[PDB]
Design a protein around this ligand. Structure first.
Ligand SMILES: COC(=O)C(C(=O)OC)[C@H]1CCCC(=C(c2ccc(O)cc2)c2ccc(O)cc2)C1
Ligand SMILES: COC(=O)C(C(=O)OC)[C@H]1CCCC(=C(c2ccc(O)cc2)c2ccc(O)cc2)C1
Lengths: 241, 10, 237, 12
C-alpha cells in the first residue's frame, strides 16, 4: 500500500491537491423565493457536488486499496457529513451565514420557509462559529474530511475481510499522525496538540448528528413528492434505510 | 450496479 | 471559577470512578420474549437507570457549575448515548452478547421480534468488540462517558467556554492515563483519536434509537414512563 | 412541569 508509506507532508499535499471545486447554484435572484425552489436549489447543488466527491474519494489515500463494495458503503454512510463539513468550512468567514455556493448565501431567517430547516441551520452555523474560533486551518480540514470518509461506515460493514477494517484503521492512524504533525509545526505544545486534536474529533460527533437529522428530512422530502430528488440522491437515501 | 458503484469504477 | 479545573488528573479519575452508577437488574421473571415483553424489560430498566444517571451527572466535575437549564439540555441530548456506552462497556467481556443487566444477557437472535432491533444490536455488538480489542480500561471509559455528557449538547446552546475547558481537562486526563499505562507519545494520540471517533458511532446509534423510541410512542403499545416521554419529546421538538 | 428539573435539584 502506498498510503501507509506517505510522510505527513505528503499526506497533506495529496489531500489538498485533491480538493473539489466550489460549485455554483442555479439561484436566480429575480425569482420569487419559495420552499419548493429553495430545496430544489440545494438538492441540485448537492447532486453535482456528489460527482466531485466520488472522484475526490478515489484520491484519499487508502480508499482505492478497498474493495468496491466497501467504497460504496463508506460513501453511502458519509456523503451528507462530507457535504456538511464542506459547507461549514466555506461559511467560516461569513458569521451568521451559510455559503451553500458563492451565489447562494443564506442567513438564519431564510432558514424557515422550509419546514425543519431552521434547527439544522443553527447547528451548521454553530459548527462554523466553532471552526472560526478554533481558527481551523485548510490542512486540518482536509484531514477531518478524510477521517469522516473512512470512519463513518467502518462499524456498519464476513471474514476474508475484517483485515479491510484493519487497513482502514491503519490509514486512520496515519491521518491522526498527520494532524498532530500540523499542530506541532504551528508551535503548539504537546498538551495543546492533544487538546486541539480532541476538539476537532469531538466536532465530528456533531457533524454525524447533523447528517442523521438531515437524512431524516431527506426521507420526508421523498415521500412528499414535491421537490424531486436526483437518481443518485435517491439511491444514497435508500442506503440509509 | 448502483449509480455510486459505476462512478467509482470509471 | 470552577473547582473542576484545579483537580489533578488522578483527582479527576478518582472522582469519576466514585461517581459511577450502580449496575441494575432486570425483572426476574420465561422465554422467549415477545416484542411487548422485550420492550417492556428494556424500557423499565432504562427508566430506573436514568434516575441514577442524573446523580452521576451531578458528580461529574464541571457539571454542577452549569445552570439548571444547561444541565437539563445536556442530559436531554445525551441520555441514550450514555445508556448505550454503559451497555457496551458492560458487554465487553461477553463477546456476541449484550449485557443489559446481569440477569438480562441478549444476543442478536433475540432482537428479531422487534423491528430494527437486530440492526442496532449489531451496531452495539460491533462497538463492544471494538472496546474489547482495544483493551479499554475503566478509567478511560468513565472519561469517555463524561465527554459524551458535556459534548453532545454543547453546540445546540462563557458557559460554552467553561464546558470546553472542562472537556480539555478530561482530554488531559485520558492522555495522562495512557502515558501512565506506558504508551508512546504516538500511541497516546493515536489511541485518543480512536476512542473519540467511536463517539461518532455512539451518536449514530442514539439517533437511530431515538427514531425507534418515537415510533414506539406512536404505536402506543409499549408504555413509556412520563420521564422517558419528556426525554423523548425534547429530541423531536 | 419537568421531572428532570425535580431530579436534578434533589440529586444525590
Ligand atoms: C429540511 O431539513 C434541511 O433543510 C436539510 C435537509 O436534509 O434537506 C433535505 C438541509 C440543511 C442544510 C444542509 C443540507 C443540504 C446541503 C449541504 C451541503 C451542501 O454543499 C449542499 C446541500 C442538502 C439539501 C437537499 C438535499 O437533497 C441534499 C443536501 C440539508
Ligand atoms: C429498534 O429499537 C431498539 O431496539 C432500540 C430502541 O430504541 O428501542 C425502541 C434499543 C436498542 C438497544 C438499546 C436500547 C435501550 C437501552 C440501552 C442501554 C440500557 O442500559 C438500557 C436500555 C432502550 C430501550 C427502551 C427504552 O425505552 C430506552 C432505552 C434501545
Amino acid at each position: 500500500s502506498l498510503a501507509l508509506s506517505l510522510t505527513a507532508d505528503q499526506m497533506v499535499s495529496a489531500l489538498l491537491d485533491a480538493e473539489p471545486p466550489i460549485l455554483y447554484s442555479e439561484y436566480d435572484p429575480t425569482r420569487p423565493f419559495s420552499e419548493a425552489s429553495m430545496m430544489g436549489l440545494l438538492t441540485n447543488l448537492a447532486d453535482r457536488e456528489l460527482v466531485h466527491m466520488i472522484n475526490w474519494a478515489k484520491r484519499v489515500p487508502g480508499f482505492v486499496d478497498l474493495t468496491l463494495h466497501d467504497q460504496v458503503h463508506l460513501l453511502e454512510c458519509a456523503w451528507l457529513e462530507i457535504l456538511m463539513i464542506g459547507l461549514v468550512w466555506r461559511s467560516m468567514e461569513h458569521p451568521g451565514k451559510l455559503l451553500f455556493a458563492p451565489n447562494l448565501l443564506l442567513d438564519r431567517n431564510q432558514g424557515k420557509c422550509v419546514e425543519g430547516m431552521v434547527e439544522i441551520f443553527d447547528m451548521l452555523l454553530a459548527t462554523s462559529s466553532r471552526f472560526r474560533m478554533m481558527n481551523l486551518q485548510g490542512e486540518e480540514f482536509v484531514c477531518l474530511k478524510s477521517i469522516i470518509l473512512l470512519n463513518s461506515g467502518v462499524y456498519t460493514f464476513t471474514l476474508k475481510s475484517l483485515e479491510e477494517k484493519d487497513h482502514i484503521h491503519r490509514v486512520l492512524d496515519k491521518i491522526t499522525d498527520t494532524l498532530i504533525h500540523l499542530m506541532a509545526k504551528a508551535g503548539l505544545t504537546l498538551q495543546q496538540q492533544h487538546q486541539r486534536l480532541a476538539q476537532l474529533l469531538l466536532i465530528l460527533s456533531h457533524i454525524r448528528h447533523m447528517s442523521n437529522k438531515g437524512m431524516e428530512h431527506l426521507y420526508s422530502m421523498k415521500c412528499k413528492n414535491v421537490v424531486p430528488l436526483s437518481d443518485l440522491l435517491l439511491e444514497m437515501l435508500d442506503a440509509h434505510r | 450496479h448502483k449509480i455510486l458503484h459505476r462512478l467509482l469504477q470509471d
